[PDB]
Each structure stands twice: as structure tokens, then as C-alpha cells.
Write a protein that binds this DNA or RNA. Sequence first.
RNA 1: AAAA
Lengths: 462, 459
Amino acid sequence: DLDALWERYREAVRAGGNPQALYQEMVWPALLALWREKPRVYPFPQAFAVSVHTLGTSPEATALAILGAGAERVYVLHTPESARFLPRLRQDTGKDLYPVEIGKSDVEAIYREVKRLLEKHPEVPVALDLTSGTKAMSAGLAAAGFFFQRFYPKVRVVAVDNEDYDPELRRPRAGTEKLRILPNPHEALAEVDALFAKELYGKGEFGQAAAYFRGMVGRTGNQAYALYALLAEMYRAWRALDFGEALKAGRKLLGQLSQNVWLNHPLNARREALEAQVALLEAVDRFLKARDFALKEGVYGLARTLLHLAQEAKEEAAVLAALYAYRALELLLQERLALLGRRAEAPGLSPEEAEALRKALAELLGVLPEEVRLPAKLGLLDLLAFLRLKGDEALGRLSLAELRGLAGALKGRNSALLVHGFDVPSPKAVEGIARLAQGLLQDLEARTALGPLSPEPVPLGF
Amino acid sequence: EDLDALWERYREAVRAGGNPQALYQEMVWPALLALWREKPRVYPFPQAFAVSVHTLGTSPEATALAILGAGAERVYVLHTPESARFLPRLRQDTGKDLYPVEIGKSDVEAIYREVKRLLEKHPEVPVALDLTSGTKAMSAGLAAAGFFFQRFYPKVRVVAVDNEDYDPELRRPRAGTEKLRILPNPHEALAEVDALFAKELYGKGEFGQAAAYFRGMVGRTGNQAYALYALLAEMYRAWRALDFGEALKAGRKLLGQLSQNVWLNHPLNARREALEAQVALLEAVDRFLKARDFALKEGVYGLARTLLHLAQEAKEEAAVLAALYAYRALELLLQERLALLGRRAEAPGLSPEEAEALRKALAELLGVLPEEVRLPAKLGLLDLLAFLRLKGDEALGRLSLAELRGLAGALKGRNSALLVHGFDVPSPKAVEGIARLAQGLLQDLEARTALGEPVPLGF
RNA sequence: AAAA
């Protein structure tokens, strides 16, 4: 019917008939008629409120799309070059077209126009037709369409497909055009969203990367992102000093990674590190639960965690960095005190010891010994001077100048912004506290079943 | 060269009955191809590509131009069953080995899969995604894939053969006016994703990290709008960092920018009254921290409010942190009620009568006898509270002895408490009692200040 | 290559 008309149109062009105008006179009334009757919309017709169409110099295409989507309000992203075809378009579709002028390659302004129209019509179904117009114009429209259904699920990118295309006439064969709704590539490639999780993980926003991954197991039915979620949850908890949780998640990950099904999960190409880390968490959670400094591995893990936390907060959470480093030094020092028999909270000071400690503290804080009251618990500076006086070897290596600086720092624990007190801690002092804590940490590391490994996270492997 | 002559002759020939496709192939295409073999016309500038990737439709001369212009060593050609035919013509024109991949004429998911693949296998090299030839659905699939993977494969350039004169009747570019053009990535240019992440962090409290995203947003967008945004997140970071001078500096900078002509319509101006208020609070706190004078009720209130809100944020996860913030807020609110009485918690000039009444107060509270109670030199949290109740303090006096009983273990929670002197994540209800007491004292203090949440980002 |  139309196929006969198309064959006779080809014959007509082969007779020297000018193909633009000949097509408009001969074929186009018939094809336009069929579409005004039964718009060919491939995955059945869909109910659209607004359609947005690029317009190029084949307005018949845009006509087909406008009828096919059947929208009420119709926008036409056209170029200065294709503006001249709006009137005929309007007369064909019998629709009032809101025109918008855009460059023929202004991908960017196309895309902004789509974001504008979408926000003008947020809750209603929208057909973004990219049929007519340059590839750049369609790139704008399609980038915006495929990106914005995350936020406007009712927005559908559409095109006028054909099932037969004439390469000499550079037209579809009349009657073989249909309007194909196009799927979003973020349906069957939801897995690619992992890179966002990979990025959220790569900045250390573990809590967020974990929520992202749990979404991934919910979005694309894969359970393998659940293992990533486990790892990220582990790091969030570990950074939070929630070693109980940190371990719960890490153990769950190592159990899953044990299974035959996850033998190939990329996290396995890091298992030696992962295992080490969860063991650290084990060591800490036991030590935290035991509170005895005999568990050198747990003390090491808590000290290394605290010092890691203070290091990464050294510039943008200075008061928090101080908190972390002060607690780390107290830990390492108290472990040193357990080594030499005693425990700082109720050390048994001999009177000779109390006088030795008072003399050291005096000639460290710059007072006469008779000004010195010994507190019942050894606080941080008392512990420092006392371990020094009991011959703790690593602490011996401290010449009285860096010791004086540490004493100055140490009086800022007794009062600070987050302690019962008021002063924001000097970053010089905090770095000195952390340098001494780091030295003790390495001493301790030389002494643990763990050996070395770091809080810093294992690669996702993807 | 004047292939313009040839193009006019080719037009002359078609208008007189000639086949446009064959005639283009014999008159125009040789000459045009000659010129593009000499000097490929790449708009921004030619750029070395490891790999170019071209959708191919029934106009292989387009993908030929695109191949020549991108000059990539390794050339994929996405094609359809219906366009596979032209692969030999393309091979001849480009003199280049091709890596054809067959795809459906509307297989947007597949262009997508293919880009994911080629990019993974060539992750760290410049790759041009040319969407010239083929269907709008084909180019659209390549473009979606490109603009998306560009973030993670930053050497990727989505490119396309533009033309400065398109013969609508020949449905062809006029020969010579074509040019290969790096299309801007709109996702990048607008940094919609960096915004979405920065919004996520900003809402979730990760102010410093949102700030870094905004600062990078400036460079990706060329729009200093996001500089202001960075400043805002900057200030909130410094504020939660408890560095109120840093927060005040940044906030004032921001208010000075939002005062300017350029940023009258900046979306943060939609909440300017808030910002103004908050920056005033910043100054209040900053003045008070500089003076430690508790007549500065607005500074004391702001800093107690800051601590109480940090202890609200952290209680879910930072748990220890949440208690430290709560204790600090309570000790603060308490020192302010105490300063209202002319007394300093730090050294109470308590007369021997007050010492007796405070040992007595703590005895009755804790249930022990008064000489079990040894009064410290600095009034501790519970001691401060019992001394305010001693001294006629109305809000603290309105606390039942059983409430103070249930609270006194919580105010014993200090020390212990992993980040202080022990190993305890103090109980969420332990933190709760402190935080609600502090909330009451905070609201009371808020009344006595003439001043009487981070602000929405506006997107 | 501005309905492949």
C-alpha cells in the first residue's frame, strides 16, 4: 500500500525527481496519514504528558515522533538552521510546539534544556525524542535522558527506528518507521555503579560505600557486592573504634570469602592482608573486652588504630587528632608499665619511688620537688617520668629537651577543648605526642604475634 | 584546495538524474579523502588516541573521516548487520586494520557493554568514542557510555564529525565543511555527579569531603559558584572541628561573597538569614573562646549547642565520641549556670560551710556518708551539679533525687570511656541522660541570649 | 555525517 507508494517514489526519484520535495508531495501525505491513524510505537504505545524532540532538517521524522509519543505539551529543541521547519512541523502534527533554539553541536545547552524541562515537569511521563537533528544534538538529549531517569523514572528516551533504511536516499523506507522506546543503559548495566562505590571507598567514606554496595546487592541481584559491603562496613566500624562490629563484619567477610562460591571474588586476591586485618580486629576486641595489657596484639591494634585516626585528622579535626594521639600514648605507656610489673591507676609507689618521681616531675615541669603532689593514678606525664625512672629502655633515649616539650604538651591533656578544660591543642604538641607514641608503637610491634600490617584498606580489585 | 568546484559539479550531476551515492563515491569522496589524509580536521585540535571506536552506518565515508581525524592506532568499528557490508570500503578508505563488533541498530545496552569492555582493557590510554555514523540510537548509546565512563576513564573523548554546511536535500554534509569535534561531556561540565556526592556528604555531615568535591567542582565546571559552596562546607567542617576562628573566617568570607553582585542569585543566598545568624553565632563562640568570660552567654550557648549536636551526630557510630561531646556540653552549661552565681567551677572558693553542705549533698545523692565524699579542688561534673542545686539553681533543683541517682552513674562514666582513660563505649542510655540534661540547660541558656543545622544547599 |  505504502510499500507500493515507496517503490513508485524510488522509481520517481530515479526519473530525476528532486527527492526532498518529491518525498514531501508523494510519500509524506500517506505516511503522515497512517501515523495520524495508528502511530507505530514499538513496545506498545505509552502515555506521555510532555515530549521533547530535537529538530533537524528532516522535520518529517520529528513529526513522526511527536505523533507517536502523543504528548500534550511538546517542546522542539531546534537549531537556527532547523527553525524554518517548525511551521510545517506544527501544521503536520497539529500540535502547538514550544520551540527552543540551541546550537547544532551544543551538547551542553541541549542537556541543560532537558534538565530545565524535566524540572518543569517532574512527576509526569516524558518522552525525550532524539530522532531528528545532529549526532551532537542527540548526544545531548540522550545523555540527559539516560542520566535523569535515576531522578525522573517517568522520563523515557525515544527514537524513530526503522526496519529498512535506503542508503541511496538516506531515508527510512516509508511505513517501516516505528517509535522505539529505548531502555536506559543503567538497567542491565547497574553493575557499573560499583565504580561510584569504588570511589566512595577510595576516599575512605566507608559507611557510604557500604550503603552503596548494599544497594548494589539490592539493585542488581548480585550477592558479590554484599562481600564488598562487608569489607566497607568493617572499615567504617574500625574507624569508628567499634571493634566489636568491625570484627563481626570482618569475620562474616572472611567466612563468605572461604566459601567455594566466592573463591574468585576479587577480594581473595588480597586475602593474606584481609585475614591479617580481621585478626588485628580480633586481637583488639579481645583486649578491649579483657582490658589486660598482657594481650600485646590487641594493645598494638588499638594503638595503631588510634594513631592512624589522629594522623588522618591531624589537619582538619585538630582537637580530635589530639584526643586520638593522647589516648594512644596512654595506651602504649600503660602497656610499658604492665611490662615492668605494675599498673598505672594503682601503682605501688615505694616512698623512694614517690620521691624519685616527684624529683623527676619537678625538674621537668620547672618547679621545686616540694610543690609536687603525686596523684593516685599516674596520668600521662607521671607515667612518662616514672617509666623513665624505672629504666624503660625506649624512654631512656629521650633527651631532656624533647622531654620538656612533651611535658608542655602533657599539661594540655589535663585541660583541653574536649577534656575537662578549654584550650584547642597546639599542632606542634600533638605531633610530638604522636611521634613519641609512634616510637613506642614500633617498639611494641617488634613484640607482637601480628608483626606489621596497617589499618589502610585492601584494594577492591575492580 | 577547491573541492568546492567538485562539490558544485557533483550537485550538477545529481540534479541531472545521477545516483547521489555512486556519484559522491566517484567525484567527491576521492578528493575529500585526499584532503583528510593530508590534514585531518579535528576542531579543538588533533589529539593522539590509542583507540578510537566508531559506530558505522550506511555512510562509511563519515566514519572514514572520523577514523582519520582521531588517528588512533587501534580502531574499533561498532556496526550492525545492515552496515557490516561497508567494512571493506572503510578498510580501503582508512588504510587501517579494523576491529569490527556487530550490534543491533537500537542496541543501546550493548554499545554500553562494549564501551565498558574496551575501556577496561585500555583503562589508562586516550580513547575516542566517535558517534558520527549509524543510527541515533547507536550514537546515543555510545554517547551515554562515553559521558558516563569518562569519569572513571578520564582519557576518553566522545567525538563526532560536525559540519558547517549540511545539504538538507542531499541529506549530506557539503564536502569540506566537515570537521571532527571533541564533544563536551555535559555530565562533567556541569559536574552533576560531584554535586550529588557533595550533597550526600554535606547532608551526612562529611563537610570536609563535600568541600573537596565542591573545590574540584570549580575546576570541572569553570563556575566559581561551587567555590562559595566549598567555603560553606569549609565553614561547617571547621565548625564541627571545633575551630571556631577557622569557621568564622570562612563564614565571613562566604557572606562577603554572597554580598557581591555575582552571587546575588547564588542558591545559598536563599538561606542567607540562616548563614548570617550562624556566622554571628560563630563570632559569638569565637569571642567567648577568646575571653573565657561566661557573660558571653551567646558564645557559651553556641559552643554548647555545637557540642550537643556533635554528640547527636556521633551517637549512632562514634558512640565514644558522642559521650565526650555530651560531657563537654554538660560541663559547659554547668559552668555557665555557675558563672551566673559569681563562682568558677575551676577553683571554687567554697567556704568550710559550703564544703560541709556539698559533701552532705553528694552523700545524700550517692547514699554514702559525707566523709566518704572527698571534695576535689576543681568541682567535677556531679559536684558542680550538686553545688548548683545547693545554691538555689532552679532547673537543677527541679531534678528529682531519683533522677540524680540514675544520672550519677552516667556522670561517673567520664574517665573510663575508651577515648579518655579506660576502655568503655558508654551506654547509649548513659549518654542519653547526659544529653537530655544538657538539652534542658541549653534551652534555658538559649532564652537568656538575645540570639533566641547546616543550611540547605539549594539543589 | 541534521530518521544509519
